[PDB]
């Protein structure tokens, strides 16, 4: 029946709640709370290393990010368990946010770094370890490649955190490689 397990579900709820807060309070008021630490005095507010992934600035990217999260996140949770999804999510949110702030500073957000990690993870784990029962469909490979391309060449309305995305993708591929060593 239900495709989305507890972790898949709770992330989606978190993103919706944060999105609603941003419409009520405005993007900036919520960023000040949830953004990657933008000053040394904030460096021990440990939630900020992750909560950047919960903010979205447009209707299109929250929808697309949550669609991919629901599908890939959902597939990982179902087949490999809630723990595996939690770890891919925390590690990719941390390292994608690191790389992004490093090159472009701290004013960014969105779940797409995590989504790209899931794309990479599901693809490579499926390739190298098909008995895992996970697999990235050809159609979704094509979809993801175009979305990446669109990001890189600024084809959306909006300024893109290409650091976070590509770093996300590298994290997912790395974790899948390690997970399938055997």
């Amino acid at each position: 029946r239900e495709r989305a397990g507890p972790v898949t579900w709770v992330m989606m709820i978190a993103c919706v709640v944060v999105f609603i807060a941003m419409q009520i309070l405005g993007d900036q008021e919520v960023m000040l709370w949830l953004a990657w630490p933008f000053d040394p005095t904030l460096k021990f507010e440990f939630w900020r290393y992750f909560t950047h992934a919960l903010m979205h600035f447009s209707l299109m990217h929250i929808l697309f990010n949550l669609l991919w999260w629901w599908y890939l996140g959902g597939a990982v949770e179902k087949r490999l368990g809630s723990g595996k999804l939690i770890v891919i999510t925390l590690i990719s949110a941390l390292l994608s946010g690191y790389v992004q702030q490093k090159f472009s500073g701290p004013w960014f957000g969105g779940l797409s770094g995590v989504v790209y990690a899931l794309m990479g993870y599901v693809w490579l784990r499926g390739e190298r370890d098909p008995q895992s029962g996970i697999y990235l469909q050809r159609g979704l490979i094509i979809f993801a490649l175009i979305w990446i391309v669109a990001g890189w060449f600024d084809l959306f309305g909006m300024s893109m955190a290409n650091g976070a995305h590509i770093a996300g993708l590298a994290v997912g591929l790395a974790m899948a490689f390690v997970d399938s060593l055997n």
């Binding site: 990217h61 779940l111 909006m158």
Partner: peptide, 4 residues
């Protein structure tokens, strides 16, 4: 603000 950049989006991921």
């Amino acid at each position: 603000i950049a989006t991921a």
